[PDB]
Amino acid sequence: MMVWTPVNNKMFETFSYLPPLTDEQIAAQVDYIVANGWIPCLEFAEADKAYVSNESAIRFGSVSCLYYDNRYWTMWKLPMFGCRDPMQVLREIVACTKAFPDAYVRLVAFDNQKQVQIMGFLVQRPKTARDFQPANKRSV
């Protein structure tokens, strides 16, 4: 029996339970976006704004149901409407991570027919992050 650690084991939604995505695996996800005609977009946040929190609820009556702070991140430029080139997305990842080397960065994609985000995963975490485990240390 192995024990799933509760200490410094924060996750990051889709694909965070798999091995970290290689550059080839990221490229494959980007190809999938383009193949389906979805709209790629990058979003980023400083460490203090990365995970869901409750601070604004101090201002509320009994209306906190499904309210969380830090769901919104900050948009990098604009969604890439009309993008049919995977290399353009990859170049924007490089540009965003270069401008904000200490930020969390996630790649998302939108479907304008359902009008909902249809994919999303983390592509950068700050080097100073120490609230997560390598795959092989998630259980003890």
Binding site: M1, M2, V3, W4, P6, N9, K10, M11, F12, E13, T14, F15, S16, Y17, L18, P19, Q25, A28, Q29, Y32, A50, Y51, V52, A57, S62, V63, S64, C65, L66, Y67, Y68, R71, V108, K114, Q115, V116, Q117, I118, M119, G120, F121, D131, R138, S139
Partner: protein
């Protein structure tokens, strides 16, 4: 003298069988699978069904003349023979929109399925489908939130949601319930849930459960940094008790409650859906009792009708079946009603049991929930059947893991994410599914332990609801 009152009995077909009727775009249409008694013509049987579900009774009444029967009568307008059956027919009935109370699923069922199933003149009757026109759809509040808004509120995208029913079904204390919930949620599941029959009982009263579950949700959320929920059961003996439970959930700030819509009933469900809309609670719907009604091919109401009814009455999630699990549900039929649950416009497709084109006129879609006897080996098939817009629930498949709930939850989460990644990379889960899970097993010890335990476990039986 014109047409006056003549007392006495005459054939239903004289008034209610209208084969040349052109249906109106506001009519509610019903497809009944009808088995007449010997010596009863299909036309008379169809006419009888139309009559006794609308305006008519067994003998002529004088009061008909004060109104316009033409305006109000249900009309049997087509009868199809059933291939492979000597005494089965599909009778199509059109009902004027004027017959129905706006916003009331209760009223719709009371007319269409109220009395006709008990008629001596038929041996069996099954309601296969209903065409709910946009003019009637628009009278309903519908789902409190629906698929898009739910994902947006939870901040969860790009994969199916994962859930788990706490087990044993009954017998755990409130504290142990919360303990199990915490351990499941912290391992990678998005949701846990009360079993359908967990309401308030001597072994665990509801408010005690709600509070401990609240503690568990918030603990798991802080630990993982992902939004977590537990479907707290609001199902109760009275509307007043049901509402008290919903209010407590609101006051705890938790995201989601559940209701057994068939055993609680449509009247209570619609009230709860309205409360959820007004207070921002997600509403998970359990279909307890549906198989009493929808299992047999010859008699009852097909689940696709019960699913349309729920979408109108209101729910954010609805159990859809798994196809591969311990409970029955044929693949093609399931694909059909899943579209009816999720999509805006569904074209007629008899190969998937869709008898009528259904236009939902922008009513939000309902998240299908696949649950019951599923485990990690089913993951590829489940992702292939449902895609991302579904919740997959593992009760036994989590609390039955040899290392406990958190490793159990992690195994399911790893399996789901591995299959999702593989699909995204262009792999065919229908053919490569086994390979995907085997590769993930070699990588994840939690997953490897689950795969070993349930490797040989399958549920393969002859299908009744064909």
């Amino acid at each position: 003298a014109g047409a006056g009152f003549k007392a006495g009995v005459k054939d239903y077909r004289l008034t209610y069988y209208t084969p040349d009727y052109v249906v109106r775009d506001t009519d509610i249409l019903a497809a009944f699978r009808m088995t007449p008694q010997p010596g009863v013509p299909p036309e008379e049987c169809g006419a009888a069904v139309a009559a006794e579900s609308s305006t008519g009774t067994w003998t002529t009444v004088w009061t008909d003349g004060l109104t316009s029967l033409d305006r109000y009568k249900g009309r049997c307008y087509d009868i199809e023979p059933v291939p492979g059956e000597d005494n089965q027919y599909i009778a199509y009935v059109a009902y004027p929109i004027d017959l129905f109370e706006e916003g009331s699923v209760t009223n719709m069922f009371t007319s269409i399925v109220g009395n006709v199933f008990g008629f001596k003149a038929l041996r069996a009757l099954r309601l296969e489908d209903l065409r709910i026109p946009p003019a009637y759809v628009k009278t309903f509040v519908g789902p409190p939130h629906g698929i898009q808004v739910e994902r947006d509120k939870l901040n969860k995208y790009g994969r199916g949601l994962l859930g788990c029913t706490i087990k044993p079904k009954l017998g755990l204390s409130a504290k142990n319930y919360g303990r199990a919930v915490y351990e499941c949620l912290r391992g990678g599941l998005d949701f846990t849930k009360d079993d359908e029959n967990v309401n308030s009982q001597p072994f665990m009263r509801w408010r005690d459960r709600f509070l401990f579950v609240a503690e568990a949700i918030y603990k798991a959320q802080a630990e993982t940094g992902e939004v977590k929920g537990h479907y707290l059961n609001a199902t109760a003996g009275t509307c007043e008790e049901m509402m008290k439970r919903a209010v407590c959930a609101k006051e705890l700030g938790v995201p989601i409650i559940m209701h057994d819509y068939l055993t609680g009933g449509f009247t209570a469900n619609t009230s709860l859906a309205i409360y959820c809309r007004d207070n921002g609670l997600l509403l998970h719907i359990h279909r307890a009792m549906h198989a009493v009604i929808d299992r047999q091919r010859n008699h009852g109401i097909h689940f696709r009708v019960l699913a349309k009814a729920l979408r109108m009455s209101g729910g954010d999630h609805l159990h859809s079946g798994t196809a591969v699990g311990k409970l029955e549900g044929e693949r093609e039929v399931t694909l059909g009603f899943v579209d009816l649950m999720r999509d805006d416009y569904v074209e007629k497709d008899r190969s998937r049991g869709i008898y009528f084109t259904q236009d939902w006129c922008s009513m939000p879609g309902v998240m299908p929930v696949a649950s019951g006897g599923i485990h990690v080996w089913h993951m590829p098939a489940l992702v292939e059947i449902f895609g991302d817009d579904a919740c997959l629930q593992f009760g036994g498949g989590t609390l039955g893991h040899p290392w406990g709930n958190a490793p159990g939850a992690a195994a399911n989460r790893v399996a789901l994410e591995a299959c999702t990644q593989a699909r995204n990379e262009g792999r065919d889960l229908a053919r490569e599914g086994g390979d995907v899970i085997r590769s993930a097993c070699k990588w994840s010890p939690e997953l490897a332990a689950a795969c070993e335990v349930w490797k040989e476990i399958k549920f393969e039986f002859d299908t009744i609801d064909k």
